[PDB]
Amino acid sequence: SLVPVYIYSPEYVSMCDSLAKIPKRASMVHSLIEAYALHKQMRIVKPKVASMEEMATFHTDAYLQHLQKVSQEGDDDHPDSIEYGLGYDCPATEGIFDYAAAIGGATITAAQCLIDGMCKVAINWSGGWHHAKKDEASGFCYLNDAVLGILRLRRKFERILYVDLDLHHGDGVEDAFSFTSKVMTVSLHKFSPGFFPGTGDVSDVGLGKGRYYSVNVPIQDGIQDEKYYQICESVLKEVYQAFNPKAVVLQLGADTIAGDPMCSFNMTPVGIGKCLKYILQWQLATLILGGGGYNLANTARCWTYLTGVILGKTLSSEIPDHEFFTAYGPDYVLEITPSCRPDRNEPHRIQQILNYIKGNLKHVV
Ligand SMILES: O=C(/C=C/c1ccccc1NC(=O)c1ccccc1Oc1ccccc1)NO
Ligand SMILES: [K+]
Ligand SMILES: [K+]
Ligand SMILES: [Zn+2]
Numbered sequence: 001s002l003v004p005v006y007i008y009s010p011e012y013v014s015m016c017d018s019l020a021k022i023p024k025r026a027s028m029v030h031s032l033i034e035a036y037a038l039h040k041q042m043r044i045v046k047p048k049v050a051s052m053e054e055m056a057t058f059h060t061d062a063y064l065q066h067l068q069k070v071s072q073e074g075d076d077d078h079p080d081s082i083e084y085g086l087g088y089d090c091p092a093t094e095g096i097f098d099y100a101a102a103i104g105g106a107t108i109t110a111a112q113c114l115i116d117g118m119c120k121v122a123i124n125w126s127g128g129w130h131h132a133k134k135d136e137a138s139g140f141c142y143l144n145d146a147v148l149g150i151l152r153l154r155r156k157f158e159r160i161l162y163v164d165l166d167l168h169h170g171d172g173v174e175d176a177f178s179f180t181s182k183v184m185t186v187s188l189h190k191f192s193p194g195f196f197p198g199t200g201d202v203s204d205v206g207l208g209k210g211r212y213y214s215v216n217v218p219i220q221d222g223i224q225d226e227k228y229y230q231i232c233e234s235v236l237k238e239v240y241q242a243f244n245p246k247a248v249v250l251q252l253g254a255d256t257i258a259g260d261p262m263c264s265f266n267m268t269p270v271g272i273g274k275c276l277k278y279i280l281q282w283q284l285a286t287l288i289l290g291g292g293g294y295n296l297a298n299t300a301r302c303w304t305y306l307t308g309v310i311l312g313k314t315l316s317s318e319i320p321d322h323e324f325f326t327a328y329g330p331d332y333v334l335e336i337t338p339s340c341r342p343d344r345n346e347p348h349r350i351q352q353i354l355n356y357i358k359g360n361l362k363h364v365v
Contacts, residue, residue, distance in 0.1 A: 164187040
């Protein structure tokens with residue numbers, strides 16, 4: 001019950017590997033974790049597959065049923081797919097319903113371990129698909145596992161904090177809870193004309209009873225570890241005091257990391273780790289999720305490193321030999337180097353944003 005749960009099975013990783021666009025990522029991540037022998041210090045738990053009942057706690061039957069049909073066959077003979085957000089951004093490829101259910105189940109299983117007092121921290125690195133809407137796929141997210149996890153947690157925990165460090169605004173999750181104060185969502189993300197999904201300005205604060213229970217930190221290109229942590233920690237301190245959460249769901253998409261095709265933020269896993277540590281020192285039930293991350297090796301480096309932090313271990317700089325060793329060339333080290341690009345974040349603007357937020361959280365009761 002001090003030992004973290006690690007949600008894993010070969011069938012689950014195989015299923016997550018089968019995504020074109022990020023092929024074999026789940027495998028690379030697990031493979032590297034295993035190769036630093038970190039699994040030996042965690043409780044490995046086979047994930048369940050989510051039932052239609054479970055998936056419907058958030059998603060609509062119309063949507064789930066459509067997803068199912070498209071999964072069996074394909075998208076020829078389905079011009080209806082546009083209505084449910086399938087298309088270039090969420091290809092209507094065969095087998096996606098099974099994929100969806102695997103991932104939803106995985107996250108739920110994680111949440112269930114936490115409810116059961118099996119652990120204080122539970123990990124599903126192949127989850128975090130935070131864009132999916134109740135009846136619409138979006139941003140390569142077919143099913144919002146984060147939301148399902150949060151809903152499962154609500155059985156035991158009255159107030160839940162969602163923190164979203166992915167490069168993108170966590171809109172799917174926010175929207176799901178925008179009208180309630182029982183879940184607070186906090187997202188740090190790039191906010192910029194034309195940048196997906198386009199939502200999440202600082203003045204996005206929630207609605208009705210949920211007003212002030214959505215926090216959004218719009219950030220510009222080229223941010224680095226030190227400044228990001230200052231921002232993050234400044235915001236999370238206020239949030240803890242104001243919201244006093246009983247449990248935490250934490251999305252750690254690695255598309256913020258230097259070297260990502262997204263080529264926007266300029267972070268390293270150390271910076272993100274500091275943010276992680278800060279949440280961990282609260283000692284709350286914590287559901288850890290992956291998300292974006294499209295430089296596959298770097299994404300594995302990052303999440304492997306962060307598992308290290310969760311375990312309180314220091315990992316060796318030298319990448320261990322293992323299935324995918326070649327992909328870590330030419331230097332074969334764990335550390336990641338910031339690019340040489342400018343930080344476009346003007347300090348005054350940041351300070352405005354931070355103050356505005358502290359003001360908003362005054363209101364919170
Ligand atoms: O990181 C994300 C979402 C990313 C995303 C959103 C809308 C459309 C495409 C996205 N994905 C990419 O641009 C992306 C970039 C590099 C490699 C693979 C990627 O996945 C794809 C690419 C094309 C279509 C679908 C998914 N959320 O955290
Ligand atoms: K985010
Ligand atoms: K909310
Ligand atoms: Zn992202």
